[PDB]
Amino acid sequence: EDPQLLVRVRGGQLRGIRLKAPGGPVSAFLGIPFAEPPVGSRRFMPPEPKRPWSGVLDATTFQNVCYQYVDTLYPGFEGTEMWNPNRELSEDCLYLNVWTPYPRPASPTPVLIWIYGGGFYSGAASLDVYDGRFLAQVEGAVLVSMNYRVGTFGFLALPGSREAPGNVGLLDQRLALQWVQENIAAFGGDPMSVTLFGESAGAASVGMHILSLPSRSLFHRAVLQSGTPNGPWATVSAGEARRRATLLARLVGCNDTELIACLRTRPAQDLVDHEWHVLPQESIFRFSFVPVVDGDFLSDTPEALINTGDFQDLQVLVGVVKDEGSYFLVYGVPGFSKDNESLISRAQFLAGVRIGVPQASDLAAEAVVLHYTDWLHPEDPTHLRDAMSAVVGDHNVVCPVAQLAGRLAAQGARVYAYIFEHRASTLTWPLWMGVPHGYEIEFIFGLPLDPSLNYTTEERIFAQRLMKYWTNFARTGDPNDPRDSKSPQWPPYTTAAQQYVSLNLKPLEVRRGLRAQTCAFWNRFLPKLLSAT
Amino acid sequence: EGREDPQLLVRVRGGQLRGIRLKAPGGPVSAFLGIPFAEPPVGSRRFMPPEPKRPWSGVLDATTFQNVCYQYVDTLYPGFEGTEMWNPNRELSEDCLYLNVWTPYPRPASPTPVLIWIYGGGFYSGAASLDVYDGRFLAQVEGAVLVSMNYRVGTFGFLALPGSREAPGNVGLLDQRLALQWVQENIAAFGGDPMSVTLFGESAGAASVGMHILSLPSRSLFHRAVLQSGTPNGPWATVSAGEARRRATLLARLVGCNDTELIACLRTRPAQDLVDHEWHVLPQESIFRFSFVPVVDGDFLSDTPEALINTGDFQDLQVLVGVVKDEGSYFLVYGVPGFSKDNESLISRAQFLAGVRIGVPQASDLAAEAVVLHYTDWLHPEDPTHLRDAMSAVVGDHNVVCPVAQLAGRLAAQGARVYAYIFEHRASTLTWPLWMGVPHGYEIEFIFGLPLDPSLNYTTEERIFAQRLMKYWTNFARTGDPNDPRDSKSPQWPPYTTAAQQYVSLNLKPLEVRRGLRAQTCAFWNRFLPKLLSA
Ligand SMILES: *[C@@H]1O[C@H](CO)[C@@H](O)[C@H](O)[C@H]1NC(C)=O
Ligand SMILES: *[C@@H]1O[C@H](CO)[C@@H](O)[C@H](O)[C@H]1NC(C)=O
């Protein structure tokens, strides 16, 4: 009985496990429950705090993954399987994981809290790419990650109802943050220095905690990687959530109370079977059950909230990867596949645009096509393919990120921005996808420090750099090494100068304007084109 | 006769002519100035098509320029060469249908290719007698036969009540065609070759050239065309029949006036009265818009220029087309607040959004906003220098550069041999401020070879550059190809194609080939904007 691995939290005693990290040992406490299991009549409901337990609870293994769709499109392929559940599915999934250094920190240590992506329909805090042992070992970070309910179970809402009020998956996240406040000191974490970070839907969740007042007293800094609370995919309105839930119920054969009660009688897989049948158009980068503008968790649209919010005592790191859109095209755009070069025709490109911008009218879609066509080479298959990627990435990620960066800076927040430009050498996906959505994560979490993974020696050095920016940012609100002259420095992003840095194998380079002309099209013009039509 | 220079006496269909021996730098040239080619379009002939000049008796003295067609005179900057050079330099009169011929001296031995110049000035001004149009240098240095004609401008040339008999519209274009017919019949008396006639012109002159390409009765009158900073298509070169009726009716009311009665009343009005009100008829506050221009009558122009270029057969056609570096800058001082020739015209963002409404007068609110969003530099959105240069580019691109691109592309796709240039050298002698860069109209003096006149103060480099441009123009007139057959040392000017979109830079440096004539921006004006305005 290693007394390093024995902790008393408010609910009772936990036994962690000592894990091996390349530079030494770390204490991991995995599968710690923070809520009553949301099963039975607790489906679709806000999470209740976990009841106190007796004796010593075993926290040496990851718990179950929240019930979700499992990707099947490319069976056995590591590029997709890395994002698949790596534990048993269950609605009993409300557990978090803590990594600390070994021995546990002598003094209060900044806490990083990770919130996975997966489009609000998948994900799990147990995937290898979220392994927190490296950050814990190399940087002395206390790292926390939680499971939260996804798909219908987290986000199915009949707005205004008692038994499906929406956003419960975010409330799951809020409870896990509350748990960190009440318990993290026992692990040597500092509850007065909590940084949230997350990628894709994980980032938009971070953003919603920024935009929801009850969350604001649970953290101090935020990192948003390749996702935002604003934009076309992260929220739906009350009316459109109501519609999708009602439609899903009809599809599984089911007064709000009565509708939800019948939904509760249904096996988990039955709800998942019809998850994808509720979207109003054929689309990519669009997800069925996502946070809803409820007037409660979200008092208004993210758009309204970021426009009018006051962000004075807030520090934020935001960024994108070089190729945010490539990945998505293979999931419904005719002419795209990982198994060839996906060189498309012009006609395929116009059709791809109606799918990438499913909300777009004929004219708006025309505007998109005309803007992304290279008129020097209008029919060049390579350009058309790269443009299709760009349309999707810009519309869903880069331009929403630029908008967020701008509003926050203008409203007093301290903002740092990046673009991630290094393609992992170990990448399973073909070269034309470049640096795809999600492939910065393994570098930030420090996987290349694991020799058995076959990352190049330069990639290991790169990983070390990124863990430093992230943890420096967690420590101080500033990603710059405070005891290191020469970098050159990573400057704050501001609306005037619009400075941001490239992260790649070469040293930091400062650029200005994050797709400034193109984001002006998405952020300023396009809204006017639809709002008149 | 008996005592005159025997080489200056020529006979044409209308009678005998006496011309003048003129000094050019390399030697003498023959000029025949102010040859009548129509009956004076005066009195009951105002607004009417031209009738050919009736034969005269005796020897017509053809030694001086004749009247300039009645027109508005620019007074914005009195005394300033920049504006004065474009102003009438002979008496204003409705009796103005005269033409000019320069030939080598003595007149050439074998039939020589003919260049016909059609001046610009928005269809409200111009004259073939202006110094920048002096054909003496092309005649002496290149051996060219050069012809230029006066044609009616303003109300006298374009006021139309479409369908009527007393004001059919496009009569200024008919003046031009008559002078083309005069060249067919008479040019051989001067040693000119009626089987090698090339039209060239700038601005409205270029629009005019393009309209002769699109109007079949003019087609048999010439073989090749150069269009300099202007096209028959685009937003200013033509009006609909409806809009011309509207403007002609309004102008009638303003001077206090059934189509026959209206026109008969307008005929009793003095010429100056009409000029005094010609600017009061435009539908909006604008720049680069002119009141009385060619009308789509379904006769001279059987359909819109845009329709005619999209469906025409241009297999047999050779065209040279191009633009200057700063097409729009000139236009900004005549109506956009914030701009002047006397300061850097550094403007604010507000002055930019207002300038866009005036420069794109036909744009709705959405389109205006589209224009503004496209031309804004979102890194420095409030920067005055950028806003100044963007305002210029908006006006240049909308009116000249993008219409030219549309033209080159549509003509090429459909058989024509098209050569394309951008002219980028600013005259050392220019009197407009530096911010205006290379303004509209300022390549003309180089094409015509004025820098060859020692007394004009051009650099030696400019004199050489001018000779190069004279070479290209006359090669293209001669053969349909601007390149020198011998000279394989000098880089080649490739044709413009839809596939490759090639064009050359014209400056002091050897020809450099560039690709894509403002390709991205022109997709906005030519593909996007029309759709936006259909909603
Ligand atoms: C330059 O001159 C114009 C016209 O006189 C004036 O309106 C403008 O304000 C001046 N520009 C500046 C800011 O110096
Ligand atoms: C050209 O330069 C000379 C010498 O300065 C001057 O006397 C003459 O008037 C100039 N001619 C112009 C301004 O065209």
Swiss-Prot record, chain A:
Enzyme class, UniProt record, top EC level:
hydrolase
- Main location, first listed in the record: other
Q: Where do glycans attach?
A: 255, 340, 454
Q: Where is the active site?
A: 200, 324, 437
Tissue occurrence: Predominates in most expressing tissues except erythrocytes where a glycophospholipid-attached form of ACHE predominates.
General function of this protein:
Terminates signal transduction at the neuromuscular junction by rapid hydrolysis of the acetylcholine released into the synaptic cleft.
What keywords are assigned to this protein? Cell membrane, Disulfide bond, Glycoprotein, GPI-anchor, Hydrolase, Lipoprotein, Membrane, Neurotransmitter degradation, Secreted, Serine esterase, Signal, Synapse
Subcellular location field: Synapse; Secreted; Cell membrane
Where are the disulfide bridges? Answer: 66-93, 254-262, 399-519
What is the official name of this protein in its record? Answer: Acetylcholinesterase
What's its catalytic activity? acetylcholine + H2O = choline + acetate + H(+)
Family that this chain belongs to? Belongs to the type-B carboxylesterase/lipase family.
Q: Which residues form a coiled coil?
A: none
For whether the record's keyword set contains Hydrolase, the answer is yes
Oligomeric form and interacting partners: Isoform H generates GPI-anchored dimers; disulfide linked. Isoform T generates multiple structures, ranging from monomers and dimers to collagen-tailed and hydrophobic-tailed forms, in which catalytic tetramers are associated with anchoring proteins that attach them to the basal lamina or to cell membranes. In the collagen-tailed forms, isoform T subunits are associated with a specific collagen, COLQ, which triggers the formation of isoform T tetramers, from monomers and dimers. Interacts with PRIMA1.
GO process annotations (BP): acetylcholine catabolic process; acetylcholine receptor signaling pathway; cell adhesion; osteoblast development; positive regulation of cold-induced thermogenesis; receptor internalization; regulation of receptor recycling; retina development in camera-type eye
- Annotated organism of origin: Mus musculus
